[PDB]
Amino acid sequence: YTVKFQPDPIDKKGWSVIDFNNCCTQDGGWYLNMGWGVESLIDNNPGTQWLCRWDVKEPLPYYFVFDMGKEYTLFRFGFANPVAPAAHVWAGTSKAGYVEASIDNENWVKLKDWTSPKIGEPNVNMDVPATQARYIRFVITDTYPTYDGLRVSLGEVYAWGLEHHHH
Ligand SMILES: [Mg+2]
């Protein structure tokens, strides 16, 4: 928990979801042309979204392993529920979960345990203990129920931190 620093999120261009366990793209390729895949989570804006598996409601937890490309020292981490013209703003139901961090994609260390107060919550950032990392692991553990049961869509994930020596 740090004071009002307000720097700017790491440019997620070298980024790339290197691993996940749930998306709508798993099924028919027609979902593919919809831009609802995991990569739709680190493309700079919450305008594009990510959709869970829809043909078969999969039980939680859902996780993702982002590869920031290089090493950093995370200060904060957060995400942002979907936002118009996102086809599923009512689906952003992330309620509880946590985020881990690793430097070799083998050994991980917990950073924090986030919790969103309502469905489709604008942004949810958390102060994460000053830790060195290359890979991040986001995990949704509980979801707010919907008119159509357990559904969930994510807008985007942000990460702050210093960049280690270019070397
Ligand atoms: Mg996005």
From TrEMBL:
Residues 43-157 form the F5/8 type C domain. Mg(2+) binds at residues 40, 43, 45, 48, 155-156. This is Chitobiase. The chain holds residues 301 to 461 of 462 of the full protein.
